[PDB]
Structures are given as C-alpha cells and as structure tokens.
Amino acid sequence: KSQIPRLSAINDLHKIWPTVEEHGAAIIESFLSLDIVRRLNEEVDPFVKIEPIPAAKTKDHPNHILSTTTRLVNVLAPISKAYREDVLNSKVLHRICSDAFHVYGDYWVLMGAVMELAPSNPAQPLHRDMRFSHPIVEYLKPDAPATSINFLVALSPFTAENGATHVILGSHKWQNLSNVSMDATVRALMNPGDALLITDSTIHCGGAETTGTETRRLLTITMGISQLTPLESNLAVPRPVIESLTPLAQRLLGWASQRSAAPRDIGLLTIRGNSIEKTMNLKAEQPL
C-alpha cells in the first residue's frame, strides 16, 4: 500500500492542498521550526500537567470520548506567545487554508489544542472528526468541498511503536464504510514540527502507545470555514492579549467580523452593517 505523501513547507507549498484533495492526507515536513516547537512546548507544559481527565466531574462540558490517558488543552492564545504570534500567522497554514476554503470564503480556528497521550495510551477507534460537535457536516453532499481540515503537528516524535496517527488514504471520498479496518491504514511517522494534514472526511485514528515509556504530544489545529461555529471560545481572552495580535489572528479567534465568498456577501458577526473591530475600537499589534 502507498504511504502518505510527504511535502516540503518551503518548496512544495502550492502542491500541499491539491495533494490532500486527491489522497485525503499529506505530511508537511517542517511545518513549524524546532524553535517554534520548543517555545510552544515550554509555554503549554504547565497547562498540560494541570489538565484533568477529559470527562472530569468538575467540567460542565465533559469529553466522554477521549481516553483517560489523554490530556487536551485548548484556547491556547492566552497561554502561548508562540501560538498566538507564530502559529496563527503561519504563511504555510494560510496558503493551505485559502486554497482549501476559497469556495466558501473566510476561515477561522475551530479548535487549536495541545494533546498529550500518556504512556500505554490505547489506539483510538477509526473515525472522522466533527461528528460529536457539528452533526450538520454529515448532511453535506459528497462533492461538497471540505468545510474543515485538521493540522496534526508533532510536538514530539511520532513512531510506529509510540502511537503515530493512522490514516486511510482515499477515505475522504468514501460513502460506504463497510471496508473500514486497521488493515487499510498507513502511519504518519513524523519528527517534531512535521504536520499531518487531513480533512474532516479522512478516516483516521491515534495509534497505540506500545512502549510504556514514551509520552507523545501534538498540536491539533482544526481550521474551518467561518460559517461553522468553533468548538472553543476566545470570549474570555483578555483584551490586552487580543490587542497584541495581528488583525488576521484576531479574525481567526472570532474577534472580528467574517465574510463569505458570495459575490455580494452580507457578512457574518456584523453590527448594523459595520464590523466588530470598527465598532469596538479594536487595536492590533500593541505589545504586551
């Protein structure tokens, strides 16, 4: 069976989205630099350590899906300078997203999360994303362009033995799922900073951690059209932090109005014909 196509973030940029469109997955080598990965890891470290189980009794929105050996931390903008500056303004991310979502219009972050899998974490069942938050997606026609995509960025090594992600190539075009099996999968073997890019229709799963010693970490960035509601809110992020961001990063976090691709677009999150940012006196790129 054919492996996941691998591409350069530096040279093959225009080829990334067409590759995913065809195969349902691609590995973007050095999507983030080792320096960005280092700072990201340092900044999120304590928040991963304090995170309780996904379905903790203290939560009003528990995640009953994820294993007890998974820790997921979202709303990263207030935690991580590297995320809010470097990741949210990534030239590579934005080229891919504009390639993917031009039919629909503006896109934003549905969820940016660090996931850490403890040693001996079991394999997830094969799945498509978005089914526990956006039931609407299952009612889209088969030829509808993908309305979200997921960048799974390695923040530590992804190996066969430590639970590297499985994907089924071509499964983004599957209508009948009688042939879903781990037999049909290939692995996303990745170094820190590499990214596995999949669509919301790509069948995939986290792999089994089999060493009992290694802790695998990733940054999952689900980017989606601004017509779909994010999984996470940035409504409680302090205004000083938001005002430190670029206008583009503000838009990605829902601190700006949005536009569809319709010729005479009337807009999303508008206030009597004016934008959020105009109405609220919203500054940008103001150092903290």
Ligand X SMILES: O=C(O)CCC(=O)C(=O)O
Ligand Y SMILES: CN1C(=O)c2ccccc2NC(=O)[C@@H]1Cc1ccccc1
Residues found near Ni ion in the complex (CB under 5 A) = 129
Q: Cβ atoms within 10 A of the Cβ of 9, count?
A: 22
Using DSSP's 3-state secondary structure scheme, residue 277 falls into helix
Nearer to ligand X by Cβ, of 166 and 251: the residue is 166
Enumerate residues 93-122 that contact ligand Y by CB under 6 A: 113
Interface with its own copies includes 230 (CB under 8 A)? yes
Nearer to its own copies by Cβ, of 70 and 244: the residue is 70
Enumerate residues 206-265 that contact ligand X by CB under 6 A: 206, 218
Rounded to the nearest whole angstrom, what is the least distance from the CB of residue 34 to Ni ion in the complex?
25
Q: What does each C-alpha distance from 256 to 17, 51, 164, 213, 226 come to in angstroms?
A: 26, 29, 36, 44, 11
Using DSSP's 3-state secondary structure scheme, residue 34 falls into helix
d(C-alpha 86, C-alpha 166), whole Å: 28
Q: Cβ atoms within 10 A of the Cβ of 174, count?
A: 18
Interface with ligand Y includes 271 (CB under 6 A)? no
Q: What does each C-alpha distance from 219 to 161, 183, 197, 201, 209 come to in angstroms?
A: 20, 27, 12, 19, 18
Work out the angle at residue 188's Cα, subtended by the Cα atoms of residues 11 and 51, and round it to the nearest 5 degrees. Answer: 110
Rounded to the nearest whole angstrom, what is the least distance from the CB of residue 180 to ligand X in the complex?
14
Q: What does each C-alpha distance from 217 to 157, 190, 205 come to in angstroms?
A: 8, 12, 15
215 binds, among Ni ion, its own copies, ligand X, none (CB under 5 to 8 A by kind): none
Nearer to its own copies by Cβ, of 22 and 277: the residue is 277
Q: Of 138, 266, 272, 288, which one interacts with ligand Y (CB under 6 A)? A: 266
Nearer to ligand X by Cβ, of 112 and 206: the residue is 206
Interface with ligand Y includes 63 (CB under 6 A)? yes
Binding site per annotation, positions for Fe cation: 127, 129, 204
Q: Annotated binding residues, as ranges?
A: 127, 129, 204
Residues near ligand X (CB under 6 A) = 124, 129, 152, 165, 204, 206, 218
Task: List residues near ligand Y by CB under 6 A.
Answer: 63, 65-66, 72, 113, 124-125, 127, 129-132, 220, 222, 266
